[PDB]
Amino acid sequence: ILPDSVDWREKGCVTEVKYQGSCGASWAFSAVGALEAQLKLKTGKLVSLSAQNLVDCSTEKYGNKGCNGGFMTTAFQYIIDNKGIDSDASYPYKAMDQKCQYDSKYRAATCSKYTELPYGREDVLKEAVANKGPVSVGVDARHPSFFLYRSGVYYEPSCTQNVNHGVLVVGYGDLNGKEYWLVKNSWGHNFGEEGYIRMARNKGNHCGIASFPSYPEILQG
């Protein structure tokens, strides 16, 4: 039996909204956001993890291009392969491609595996958000309505199921009858509701929110 509403901010699993700047690294912010929540569930400690570490180190082997884009799934694979990711404090974000400076001395999290959810399945996404944690997703963000969004439940008739911007689903609910996904963006506090957007849910995979969902886990064995 799934809750009607969830908000992982209430469970202490969501760090401050970040500002990616002119670097196209939303993939890296989406990935660290998902892992931040799993780290809190494991250790009780909420700590921002290094998006820069992913930008600089999860590169050609993972199909990622730093400030020119990339993928959450392969970001997670880098963290698995590397046996760690640094804290954001120890390896801060500069919004540029830099030489990899990963140092195991400042490791703040590990990742054992990741899971991809099936294309377009908002019911499966709901279950994962309720029972696993925040889920990294792609959205179609290429409409003025998206970047100008201030409040309410976002619905854009021209949205497609093709995704181009990485964000984090941290919850869901309903606002005066409109079902929504609660989405953490990485465009700082002047986007949306202090950095968050509520996006239409159960409206035929609106803006591709359920097209490419994935989440990491931190496990023994």
Binding region for ligand BJY (CB under 6 A): 26-27, 30, 62-63, 71, 74, 77, 138, 162-166, 212
Min dist. Cβ of residue 209 to ligand BJY (A): 11
Of the pair 61, 150, the CB lying nearest ligand BJY is at 61
d(CA 182, CA 201) in angstroms, rounded, equals 9
Beta carbon of residue 3, minimum distance to ligand BJY (angstroms, whole number): 26
* Residue whose CB is less far from ligand BJY, 8 or 212: 212
Residue whose token pair is 């956001």: 33
Could you tell me the smallest distance in angstroms from the CB atom of residue 40 to ligand BJY? 22
Task: Indicate the SS3 state at residue 44.
Answer: coil
DSSP state of 53: H
Q: Cβ 214 to ligand BJY, closest distance in Å?
A: 9
Least distance (Å) from ligand BJY to the CB of residue 199?
14
19 - beta bridge partners? 187
Cβ-based nearer residue to ligand BJY, 151 or 165 = 165
Residue with tokens 């990742």: 111
Q: Which is nearer to ligand BJY, 37 or 72 (CB)?
A: 72
Other CB atoms within 10 Å distance of the CB of residue 107: 16
Can you state the angle between helices 72-82 and 26-43, rounded to 10 degrees? 50
Q: How far apart are CA 16 and CA 79, in angstroms?
A: 21
* Residue 33 or 192 with smaller CB distance to ligand BJY: 33
Which tokens sit at 161? 């199921």
Identify the helix (H) or strand (E) that includes residue 37.
helix 26-43
